[PDB]
Design a protein around this ligand. Structure first.
Ligand code: HEM
Ligand code: HEM
Lengths: 112, 112
């Protein structure tokens, strides 16, 4: 929590459609990617990640919507390589976008 | 069959490892992608497609290995958009690589 922590269910409405803001989680961190609407908007190539935990899709290079989990995604089955890929993506989003807070894991308590 | 048609089981060994040749199917067409070993070899980024029907992975933009089907993949559940993507990929492989023959669908008889 630099600002506010979210559960996955709480993140869903921030998809650029139900709310003009687009939030997206990568490796436990929620980013404000509203300025990247060309990517994450409803007509964007990566719109499947809007309001979602994008970790598994980014880590495995998979845009298939049916591959996204609805609630909590335990990433413990990712390979070493997929985990390294996920970390690379996290670094890029950290550089480019505002970090809003944590995506809470199941049972994890909020901060601030 | 410009040369030879394959079932998915017959295609498997052409992965650059069990055989130096790498064959790959896209939208029912088998291509010789041996010259693209930098992509499809065992250390390549797209090695998951070597000796496989790559149609679903290319169409849905998904490199996740567990998403590949082992035998015949009925593509009838792809979306209109995924089908258009698959066609785009087919055009590119047609331009770049040698077309060997058909990937036989289940029950489909060989030609020549
Ligand atoms: C042939 C396949 C792909 C190609 C050639 C490609 C190419 C690109 C290019 C050129 C950019 C930069 C866009 C720009 O700055 O205008 C980009 C950004 C990006 N790509 Fe792709 N991509 C592909 C597939 C994928 C897949 C499968 C994923 C995720 C599962 C993905 C996720 C992303 C993300 C998250 C960005 C960052 C956009 C941002 O700056 O926030 N891409 N890609
Ligand atoms: C951020 C994600 C991605 C980026 C930036 C990206 C970028 C690229 C680039 C730059 C090339 C040309 C390589 C060269 O000519 O040296 C390429 C080729 C290719 N990409 Fe990706 N890619 C991404 C993800 C994917 C995914 C998810 C798939 C498939 C599911 C994919 C499939 C392919 C294929 C089949 C080629 C053709 C190689 C050939 O010429 O046979 N890519 N990509």
């Amino acid at each position: 929590s630099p600002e506010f922590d979210f559960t996955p269910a709480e993140l869903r409405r921030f998809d650029g459609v139900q709310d003009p803001r687009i939030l997206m989680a990568i490796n436990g961190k929620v980013f404000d990617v509203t300025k990247g609407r060309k990517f994450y908007g409803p007509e964007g190539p990566y719109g499947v990640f809007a309001g979602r935990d994008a970790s598994r899709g980014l880590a495995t290079f998979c845009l298939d919507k049916e591959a996204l989990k609805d609630e909590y995604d335990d990433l413990s089955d990712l390979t070493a390589a997929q985990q390294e890929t996920l970390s690379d993506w996290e670094s890029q989003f950290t550089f480019k976008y505002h970090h809003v807070g944590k995506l809470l894991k199941e049972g994890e308590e909020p901060t601030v």
